[PDB]
């Protein structure tokens, strides 16, 4: 972390898609994504 909004940005747009959508399945490269757009979507990993 400590890089402004690098993670929150992708996460923000990531939740947006999963919502607007067709089946949903996701992958996160970099632990931060797995901790952020996570809980709400673990059963979606």
């Amino acid at each position: 972390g400590l890089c402004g909004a690098i993670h929150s940005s992708v996460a923000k747009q990531m939740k947006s898609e999963a919502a607007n959508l067709k089946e949903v399945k996701i992958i996160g490269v970099g632990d931060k994504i797995r901790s952020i757009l996570h809980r709400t979507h673990s059963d979606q990993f």
């Binding site: 972390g1 890089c3 402004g4 909004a5 929150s8 923000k12």
Partner: protein
């Protein structure tokens, strides 16, 4: 009775009498002077000597000089013939328009209305100022106080209120300039003339002016408040009138007291102030009040030294108000005017059973979000917003938009805001703040909310910002 000046130190003149020692508070006239020099007795030092406070410069006095007991305390012309006139601590006209020809004369020292004489009606006084109306609403016949360090907005706020409230008030007004700038008295007088609240042609003036400014010796500044006060008391009780009483600045009365106090020979209390600070504020503040006979809505500017609100002067004044508008240099420096601190201003009317729960819930709503923003600020300060939670960042957005929407252009400050003064109606304030809270404008930019009246203008500004 004729006494003799025994000692002179600044404004403390000690006079000795041979037969007939004047009681405390009695006004004596010094003999042998080009102009009137009234001395107010302060205490009996024993040995037939009285220690007094001069009401004007004491230069030229000489030990052994003769002094005459006036037989009473400073007395001043009271009645409707003071309306539209400018007067002194000692009640003489200073507007070069002749004598104030009144039927009665009142003494500036009176006791405060009794307990049984008190009133408890609580009516909201809408001013058109967003922050004040929403968060620390004033009240008819109530006591309001505007706390402010140097150059923060106390006077501009009094002016705007004079404009927004005094101007359309059925009933009289009394402006008492205590220890402030002379130019201001002059700025006001002429302005009052212009808008016709002061009429030099007819008897239609609705304002009486009393002044004891920054150029007077301490004793004058220590008593003019009492003098403006007395004028107001006449309309209240002798005519059952609804009065408006503006004082700029009541802090100066206390300061004046601290100036003579060492001379009266007193061990100082904390911060060099006089040990009698509270009682002096008290027997004076307690006459500035509404009663069963009449109503006094009073707005008092309270200068805060070195910006320290823990200063004995301002500190001791909170307890006398019903509503307080605490101005902040920090806010002012952000460009928010009026620079009112939203989490530090209060009003005994901020009760659901008085302003309605709609009002009561928006009010507490706004404060809660600003309080929340306030705690995030420490971290925002080193690391900015990045590390903030999506949720936390929304309080921050809303808080910064609420903070801006609390500012507003005053007619009186048009020359500086570069914008036309606005007066927002209460329901417009309750509303505009609801929506903000409610997320109905999370899309607009902050700048849209800065310096506007009604919310509708904030939306527009947003379009113009494109």
């Amino acid at each position: 009775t004729t006494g003799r000046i025994v000692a002179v130190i600044g404004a403390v003149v000690d006079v000795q009498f041979d037969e007939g020692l004047p009681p405390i508070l009695n006004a004596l006239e010094v003999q042998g002077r080009e102009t009137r020099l009234v001395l107010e007795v302060a205490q009996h030092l024993g040995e037939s000597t009285v220690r007094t406070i001069a009401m004007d410069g004491t230069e030229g006095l000489v030990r052994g000089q003769k002094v005459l007991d006036s037989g009473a305390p400073i007395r001043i012309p009271v009645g409707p013939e003071t309306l539209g006139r400018i007067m002194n601590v000692i009640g003489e006209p200073i507007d070069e328009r002749g004598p104030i020809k009144t039927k009665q004369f009142a003494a500036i020292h009176a006791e405060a209305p009794e307990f049984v004489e008190m009133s408890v009606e609580q009516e909201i006084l809408v001013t058109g100022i967003k922050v004040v109306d929403l968060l620390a609403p004033y009240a008819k016949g109530g006591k309001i106080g505007l706390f402010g360090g140097a150059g923060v907005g106390k006077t501009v706020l009094i002016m705007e209120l004079i404009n927004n409230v005094a101007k359309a008030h059925g009933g009289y007004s009394v402006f008492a300039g205590v220890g402030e700038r002379t130019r201001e008295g002059n700025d006001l007088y002429h302005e009052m003339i212009e808008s016709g609240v002061i009429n030099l042609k007819d008897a239609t003036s609705k304002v009486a002016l009393v002044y004891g400014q920054m150029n007077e010796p301490p004793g004058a500044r220590a008593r003019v408040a009492l003098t403006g006060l007395t004028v107001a008391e006449y309309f209240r009780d002798q005519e059952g009138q609804d009065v408006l009483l503006f004082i700029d600045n009541i802090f100066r009365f206390t300061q004046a007291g601290s100036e003579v106090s060492a001379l009266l020979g007193r061990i100082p209390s904390a911060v060099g102030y006089q040990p009698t600070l509270a009682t002096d504020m008290g027997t004076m503040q307690e006459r500035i009040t509404t009663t069963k006979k009449g109503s006094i809505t009073s707005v008092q500017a309270i200068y805060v030294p070195a910006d320290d609100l823990t200063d004995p002067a301002p500190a001791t004044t909170f307890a006398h108000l019903d509503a307080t508008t605490v101005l902040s240099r920090a806010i002012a420096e952000l460009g928010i005017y009026p620079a009112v601190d939203p989490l530090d201003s209060t009003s005994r009317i901020m009760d659901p059973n008085i302003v309605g729960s709609e009002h009561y819930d928006v009010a507490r709503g706004v404060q809660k979000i600003l309080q929340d923003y306030k705690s995030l600020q420490d971290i925002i300060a080193i690391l900015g917003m990045d590390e903030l939670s999506e949720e936390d960042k929304l309080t921050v957005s809303r808080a910064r938009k609420i903070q801006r929407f609390l500012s507003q252009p005053f007619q009186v400050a048009e020359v500086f805001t570069g914008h036309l003064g606005k007066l927002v109606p209460l329901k417009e304030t309750i509303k505009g703040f609801q929506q903000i809270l409610a997320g109905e404008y999370d899309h607009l930019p902050e700048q849209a909310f800065y310096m506007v009246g009604p919310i509708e203008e904030a939306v527009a500004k947003a379009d113009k910002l494109a």
